[PDB]
Amino acid sequence: AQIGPVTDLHITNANISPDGFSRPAVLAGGTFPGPTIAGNTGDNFQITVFNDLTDPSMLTDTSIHWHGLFQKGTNWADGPAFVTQCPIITGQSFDYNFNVPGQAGTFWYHSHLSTQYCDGLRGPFVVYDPNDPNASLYDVDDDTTIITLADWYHTLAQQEPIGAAITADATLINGLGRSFTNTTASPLSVITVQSGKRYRMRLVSISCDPNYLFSIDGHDMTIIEVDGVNSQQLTVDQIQIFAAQRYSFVLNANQPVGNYWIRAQPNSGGQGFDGGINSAILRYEGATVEDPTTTAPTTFSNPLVETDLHPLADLGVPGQPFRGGADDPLVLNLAFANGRFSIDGVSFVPPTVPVLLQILSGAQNAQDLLPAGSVISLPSNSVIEVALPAGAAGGPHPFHLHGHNFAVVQSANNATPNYVNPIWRDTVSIGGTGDNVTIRFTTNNPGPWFLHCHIDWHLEAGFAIVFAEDIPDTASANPVPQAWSDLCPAYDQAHNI
Numbered sequence: 001a002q003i004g005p006v007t008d009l010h011i012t013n014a015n016i017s018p019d020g021f022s023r024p025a026v027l028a029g030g031t032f033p034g035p036t037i038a039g040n041t042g043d044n045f046q047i048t049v050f051n052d053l054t055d056p057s058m059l060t061d062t063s064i065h066w067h068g069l070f071q072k073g074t075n076w077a078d079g080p081a082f083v084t085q086c087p088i089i090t091g092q093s094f095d096y097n098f099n100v101p102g103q104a105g106t107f108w109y110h111s112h113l114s115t116q117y118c119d120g121l122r123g124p125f126v127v128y129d130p131n132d133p134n135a136s137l138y139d140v141d142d143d144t145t146i147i148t149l150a151d152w153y154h155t156l157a158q159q160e161p162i163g164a165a166i167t168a169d170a171t172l173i174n175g176l177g178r179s180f181t182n183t184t185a186s187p188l189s190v191i192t193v194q195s196g197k198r199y200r201m202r203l204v205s206i207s208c209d210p211n212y213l214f215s216i217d218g219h220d221m222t223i224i225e226v227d228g229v230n231s232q233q234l235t236v237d238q239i240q241i242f243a244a245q246r247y248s249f250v251l252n253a254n255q256p257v258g259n260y261w262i263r264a265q266p267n268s269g270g271q272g273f274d275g276g277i278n279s280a281i282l283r284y285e286g287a288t289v290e291d292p293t294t295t296a297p298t299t300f301s302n303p304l305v306e307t308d309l310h311p312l313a314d315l316g317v318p319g320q321p322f323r324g325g326a327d328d329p330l331v332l333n334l335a336f337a338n339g340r341f342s343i344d345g346v347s348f349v350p351p352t353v354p355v356l357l358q359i360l361s362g363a364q365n366a367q368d369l370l371p372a373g374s375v376i377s378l379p380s381n382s383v384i385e386v387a388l389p390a391g392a393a394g395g396p397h398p399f400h401l402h403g404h405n406f407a408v409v410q411s412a413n414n415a416t417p418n419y420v421n422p423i424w425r426d427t428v429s430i431g432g433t434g435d436n437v438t439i440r441f442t443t444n445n446p447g448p449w450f451l452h453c454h455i456d457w458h459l460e461a462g463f464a465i466v467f468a469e470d471i472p473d474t475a476s477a478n479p480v481p482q483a484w485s486d487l488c489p490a491y492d493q494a495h496n497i
């Protein structure tokens with residue numbers, strides 16, 4: 001069952017074996033992925049997170065981010081450790097109490113402390129629309145139509161050796177899949193459909209790193225939502241989905257009753273489908289309980305290309321229709337060297353005092369804010385443009401902005417900008433060498449908002465900055481509860497800081 005919008009959520013350690021290999025994990029709700037948190041647009045969510053972690057190998061502190069929810073007036077509830085809060089310590093709990101006005105779509109939640117989400121703290125977060133403009137396009141939309149794609153590691157996140165390459169050991173679809181090496185015939189996930197019905201499949205990348213080439217043998221997929229933003233219908237037969245992105249697509253159960261492979265090919269780790277790696281099963285009601293015998297094409301006919309997506313609503317693009325046509329036009333220098341990433345020459349290292357607390361305590365320019373050179377002020381009520389030229393090692397990098405979605409004025413692998421009708425989203429691949437992926441948004445949400453690569457290993461290695469949006473109005477806009485004010489003293493006492 002789905003939980004929420006008012007719920008407890010316990011964070012525990014447990015052993016799991018999603019690919020047949022047992023290892024300890026950090027879990028929400030006792031499962032991997034965690035349970036779906038759900039409600040309706042505009043609802044009040046009160047997620048009381050109980051930190052019951054005891055195993056220091058995966059960190060006993062935690063903090064949870066609600067990915068893609070704007071948190072307007074509740075920046076303190078956003079979750080990134082040392083940006084909006086100190087972590088919750090073990091044996092304590094914290095109520096993330098926020099509202100979701102004006103948003104409806106497919107989201108997710110994850111630890112936002114270190115690389116802890118890789119150790120298991122990740123799950124779906126759905127905000128339904130009782131008046132969804134897409135409602136007539138499908139018959140079924142429920143917990144059985146959520147599809148999560150996850151990378152899974154045998155080595156614990158904190159134990160990944162300095163200086164060796166990090167790759168996953170299994171792809172998990174709805175929490176199950178097979179290991180790339182020492183493959184065993186562990187159970188695969190089954191997604192069940194009824195011949196003749198149409199399903200809103202909510203595809204969620206909960207990846208710490210790889211992008212996936214997602215497809216379903218014999219079927220095509222009609223995209224209707226991108227990162228929470230309703231889209232015009234776009235029919236594709238493969239979706240390249242980067243870490244933290246979401247799509248809804250209509251699946252029409254219009255093929256013969258049978259079994260079809262669901263494929264999720266990561267860009268690193270095991271290549272292909274031998275032994276049933278990178279796979280799940282689409283099973284029609286009445287089909288034999290057996291593996292599919294289908295194959296993929298050699299070449300997909302209609303892969304998703306991001307410039308083909310357009311909003312359902314008339315969202316336009318803020319600003320003027322040329323490069324630099326914004327109130328605050330920025331170009332970030334994104335680089336990697338010697339194990340660390342940098343933005344404008346500064347590698348992100350989390351500060352001792354969370355950025356929000358520094359602002360509430362009276363630090364009112366971004367030059368005053370720690371870490372020095374990692375916090376950039378944005379002016380209020382202004383059009384912002386951010387160019388994110390690629391080239392840094394470890395790409396393609398999926399950049400994500402908290403507190404906002406944005407127009408993707410320029411996408412990967414295409415030099416032509418779109419100032420008319422590009423998709424809006426919250427996580428975007430910045431592409432390959434020579435690209436100039438560019439985003440735009442307006443600043444109507446005071447507070448410190450993280451901007452970073454969503455490959456968690458890259459965030460850990462410094463690939464981030466904080467946009468301190470409307471510093472002067474942050475305190476008035478974001479009243480804080482006593483429990484939030486209590487977090488840093490409790491954390492600092494427990495850690496002798």
Ligand SMILES: *[C@@H]1O[C@H](CO)[C@@H](O[C@@H]2O[C@H](CO)[C@@H](O)[C@H](O)[C@H]2NC(C)=O)[C@H](O)[C@H]1NC(C)=O
Pocket residue numbers: 323324330331387389434435436438
């Ligand atoms: C990406 O686009 C930005 C503008 O959005 C380019 O920025 C300009 O960079 C040149 C130097 O390279 C400056 O002289 C301009 O002041 C910048 N802003 C402009 C023209 O609006 C940037 O060069 C582009 N990067 C790549 C790799 O194509």
Ligand SMILES: *[C@@H]1O[C@H](CO)[C@@H](O[C@@H]2O[C@H](CO)[C@@H](O)[C@H](O)[C@H]2NC(C)=O)[C@H](O)[C@H]1NC(C)=O
Pocket residue numbers: 305307308414415416417418419
């Ligand atoms: C590269 O991106 C551009 C800009 O998004 C795409 O150009 C648009 O193409 C559509 C479809 O033919 C036209 O309706 C628009 O008028 C074009 N806009 C602009 C600004 O040119 C283009 O299709 C993309 N290239 C590829 C190969 O997909």
Ligand SMILES: [Cu+2]
Pocket residue numbers: 065067068110244454
């Ligand atoms: Cu996220």
Ligand SMILES: [Cu+2]
Pocket residue numbers: 065066067068400401402403
């Ligand atoms: Cu986020």
Ligand SMILES: [Cu+2]
Pocket residue numbers: 394395396397398453454455458459463
């Ligand atoms: Cu990256």
Ligand SMILES: [Cu+2]
Pocket residue numbers: 065080112400402450452
């Ligand atoms: Cu983040």
